[PDB]
């Protein structure tokens, strides 16, 4: 196989030999893709979810520390607002610790990033990473509009700060259109980070049924539909010609779970973190692409595809290797 | 506790003293119920998903059997158009076998017939019950709307052959409005089953933004949003003060998965069981209830809700205990 993971050949979304039974070659081409770079731990990427399972051993490689923190002192050392922010936060309780109690952020994380070539479960879309949680979704889903602001307002700092932050995973949605959330939004964007948002799994059109944040017409905001292991769109995503901006495999993926497991989930959330690892990929090569370059190479590097053509901006399907060739410097 | 089913106490739907950190007797008051009827394997319930793990341990019990079958003769002995199905079918293959690959289905199917006090893992609503399952969701998410179809027309041929099945679980939801699922739900109303669907999960209003099946204007239909541990409406539920009814437990709840486990999921999906459940364990106190008396008893017997009032129709919070005093014959 491409890596020694032992799971490796059951993610077929980055490398597709029809094992799943699918079609050969409906994948990123990450394989290809890593002959140039696996990836940085010098990059970092905001995982804004249920948390990040920052101990499972397949995660633990790639998870950020805080160079401004002294662990377990019970002092917010770099003066961030949070104390002990090692690894992340928790938008809810304030608390310095993103430790996912759910599972989703955890899963998330791992297509973004599990450690590549150790011998141990799957691989990211980056063999190496540092991947940063703020968690605002609780064990039992509970969480707000204003959590998610304090996660973006949180990264925001770190990047301002001068954390190597430019990427942000955003699987999740609900909710109408907020002005605080489009401003927290506005403000990631003069700080030159990408906000990658999930589509929705409801099968229908976001251009006549707005769904956010994926809706939100900030340019840094890039939208993600869901593909299959056909390169089909998935059955249950969401599209939109203009408010939808291209395709990432989200059907039956396997990933890193807490408890030491791995799970296998589907969703436009699962869709998300392939895009979001191939932008952490993508500035692991080429690191002086302005937020709209990285946005505009990812939907212009994937492979055209049939079922996502006239359903959203680009009409493609991400392609890693083909964005790392256009990418150069 | 109330059953010696070891992990009943992760079961606040069912019963809530506070210890999961939520509000005491935010609850459906399931023990309290439980000394009236802990169900009746003679009441069949259908769950419309990823299939059924009939294996699983806590579920193998409580699994319907098609007494018309004779199992792996490759004969369709009953003649209602599937070979072999002993436990339910697969509507994407076509074959006999309903096993869940995904989880979602075994989940919800825990939610409402896990065996209770067998010193196991979990128990549903219903200690008892018959549960068959139709898989329309592929492990990889894949479905369609002539596959759900299927699967409804499935389960009335069941209750048309004589079969006591009268509430389906349908723990899904997309696309945009059917005519043709419109008509199977119909034919589901004419053969006196309940057809309880979920709200779902994206925090907006269903009158204004209508969501499919939730939003079928079918008698039968019964909507369910999802509510957490503290009797809050759970943030991320839709709602609708005319196209949602009522309200059960959907955040954390732990359940059966395939493999022998068990795990905690979030979602509308999980509120829907607890109803369906609910409406079984209704019928074997009294069976000679309609489908429309069964969805007005369920909506009336539930406890008043603060925050459902004014975003459903009924403001009530599920409580099958009340439900099985009301109905009692
Ligand atoms: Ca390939
Ligand atoms: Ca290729
Ligand atoms: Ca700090
Ligand atoms: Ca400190
Ligand atoms: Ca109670
Ligand atoms: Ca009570
Ligand atoms: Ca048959
Ligand atoms: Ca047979």
Redesign the pocket.
């Known amino acids: 196989s491409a890596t020694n993971d032992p799971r490796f050949d059951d993610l077929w979304g980055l490398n597709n030999e029809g094992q799943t039974g699918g079609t050969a070659d409906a994948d990123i081409d990450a394989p290809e893709a890593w002959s140039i770079s696996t990836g940085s731990r010098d990059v970092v990427v905001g995982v804004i979810d249920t948390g990040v399972d920052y101990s499972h051993p397949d995660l633990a490689a790639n998870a950020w520390v805080?160079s401004?923190?002294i662990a377990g002192d019970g002092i917010?050392?770099?003066?961030?607002?949070?104390?002990?922010?090692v690894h992340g936060i928790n938008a809810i309780t304030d608390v310095?610790d993103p430790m996912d109690d759910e599972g989703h952020g955890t899963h998330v994380s791992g297509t973004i990033g599990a450690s590549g070539n150790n011998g141990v479960g799957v691989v990211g879309v980056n063999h190496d990473v540092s991947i940063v949680g703020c968690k605002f979704l609780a064990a039992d889903g509970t969480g707000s509009t204003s959590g998610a602001i304090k996660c973006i307002d949180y990264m925001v700092g770190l990047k301002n700060a001068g954390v190597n932050l430019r990427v942000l995973n955003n699987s999740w949605g609900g909710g109408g259109f907020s002005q605080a959330l489009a401003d927290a939004i506005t403000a990631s964007e003069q700080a030159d980070i990408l906000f990658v948002a999930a589509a929705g799994n409801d099968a229908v059109d976001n251009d006549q049924n707005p769904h956010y944040p994926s809706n939100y017409e900030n340019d840094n905001v890039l939208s993600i539909a869901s593909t299959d292991s056909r390169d089909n769109m998935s059955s249950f995503s969401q599209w939109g010609l203009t408010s939808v901006d291209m395709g990432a495999p989200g059907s039956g993926i396997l990933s890193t779970v807490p408890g030491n497991s791995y799970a296998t989930y589907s969703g436009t959330s699962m869709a998300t973190p392939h895009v979001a690892g191939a932008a952490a990929l993508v500035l692991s090569v080429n690191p002086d692409l302005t937020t709209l370059e990285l946005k505009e190479l990812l939907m212009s590097s994937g492979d055209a595809n049939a079922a996502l053509n006239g359903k959203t901006v680009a009409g493609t399907r991400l392609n890693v290797n083909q964005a790392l060739i256009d990418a150069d410097p």
């Open positions: 805080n401004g923190e917010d050392n770099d003066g961030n607002g949070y104390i002990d922010d310095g």
